[PDB]
Design a protein around this ligand. Sequence first.
Ligand SMILES: [Fe+3]
Ligand SMILES: [Fe+3]
Ligand SMILES: [Fe+3]
Ligand SMILES: [Fe+3]
Ligand SMILES: [Pb+2]
Ligand SMILES: [Pb+2]
Lengths: 317, 317
Amino acid sequence: QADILDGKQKRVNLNSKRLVNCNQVDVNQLVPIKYKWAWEHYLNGCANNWLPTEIPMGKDIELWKSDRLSEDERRVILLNLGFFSTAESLVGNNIVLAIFKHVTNPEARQYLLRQAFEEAVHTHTFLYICESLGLDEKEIFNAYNERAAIKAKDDFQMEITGKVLDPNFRTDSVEGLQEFVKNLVGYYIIMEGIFFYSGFVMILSFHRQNKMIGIGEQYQYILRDETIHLNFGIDLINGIKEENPEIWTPELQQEIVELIKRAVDLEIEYAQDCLPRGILGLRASMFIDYVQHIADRRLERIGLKPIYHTKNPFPWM
Amino acid sequence: QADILDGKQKRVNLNSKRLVNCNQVDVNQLVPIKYKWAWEHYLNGCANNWLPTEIPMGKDIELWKSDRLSEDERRVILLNLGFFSTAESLVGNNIVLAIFKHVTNPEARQYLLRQAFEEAVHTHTFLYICESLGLDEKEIFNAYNERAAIKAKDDFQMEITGKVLDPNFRTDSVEGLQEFVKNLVGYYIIMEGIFFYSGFVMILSFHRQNKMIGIGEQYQYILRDETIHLNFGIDLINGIKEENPEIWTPELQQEIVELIKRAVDLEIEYAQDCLPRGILGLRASMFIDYVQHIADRRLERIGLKPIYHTKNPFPWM
Ligand SMILES: [Fe+3]
Ligand SMILES: [Fe+3]
Ligand SMILES: [Fe+3]
Ligand SMILES: [Fe+3]
Ligand SMILES: [Pb+2]
Ligand SMILES: [Pb+2]
């Protein structure tokens, strides 16, 4: 039996748990779980475990070093490796330094720990593809300083990363929680849900034609993870809105649509840099449509109306 | 080629990387890796991947529900599940909320992301063992509020968890970095390296006698992970000391020995609570010796002299 009798009064009540600002209850005990969707995404992520180096790169190395790829095909590969190599760190660092501190719920934190480890796996994937192909990884990982279209995306991402890191930042004010929700939209909806999906189409287009299949297979594994990351983020944003409805004002709704519009513009500029002429039958115009179409699907999932209405040119995605 | 020419000046120099207070260099680019030991522990951890529920619990359930275990054997199981169920969260939360922010180095952060996900796997293990055995997990997870010997350990652990969480905490002062090193000693050397190893002996003693082998096999997997956690922590503490020698003063050295002495006292009290009479040929006196012996081995690894000199009564550990 208990030898500290008062301790029995401290067991956590299911109905007292909340996703943010929950400080009146012990957030170190996992049970009783309230947000079962977080536990399910955690189990699903654990089941998807993979390591990049189980995927062979020999065929990719022989093709990359041959004269069989055009300069335009190489450029698509190099720009995506440049963008993804540091963006995975940007996402993993934000989960840990910004999101976990403020999501005051153990089962959602359990999922965040799996998501941040998967982003570490994604970074390892890019080091492995650089070292396998013989690229100078110090140049590829610094692409966000050397290539304008990539720097513009990442500088935009910092516009929602800085506030939540301030030593005095708190979510126990309407404005503070709105700022935290914009960070979640920026990382889950925009970086993982729009910026990365655009690079997936480009790389998976090579894989579909039996080219650079080792890199293609790694991106298939990253997309399977990203699908759960986006789904968790959408559940967390909608769960926070439901529990704190006074933050979902027309002003915040419009600021979120403006952020997504800005992100679509930057991603179209990056697709143009990736495809100045076109490869594999892809043209940059197909991206103006695809990026706009997925932006609309992300707006719908968080309760906002589509704004572009464009059809999807890549049904296989 | 680069379309932002100045960006080439931003590539990271290997010699400018440091484990803490490194803010003059881009800490989002993984390369060039400097602390190869961190990358190696990260690869070794990834290779050790396991899920608790791949270990069958049927034989354990039948034994636990039979009248074949004594009350004294059940007490050892219940008290260890009570302590470990929330301590794994305490460790995972500290990695994320305290350690990662201040270890300003991407490859050490890559390892931290694997360690924090393994602590999430360890928490899942305890929920799974509770639900398999039919225990009321709300009682087991609240043991740190209901059982004095467990509460004393955890209240002690909070004595080095609180400072580093203050909004204004910084490591760019000698005192601030000393405080951060005491947090690392508290979690890696004391909680993972002394408190957990003592519970491992107790549980692995059942496994050696073919009892509760499903729980034993899970603890074998946790010990394999904990071995790397402790080794990484020892490398990180020694790396910080080497790079900031002015923090390793006789005053700090003596405060660390006093913390370890206090932890040994609390762990002996917990071993006595676990074994008021003795089971499986184990007696609590064997723990006074074992805890003292491992404390000495942890002191040696961070450059302090052994103080107890006791022999190890469990050579198989
Ligand atoms: Fe990722
Ligand atoms: Fe992601
Ligand atoms: Fe653990
Ligand atoms: Fe550990
Ligand atoms: Pb622009
Ligand atoms: Pb005492």
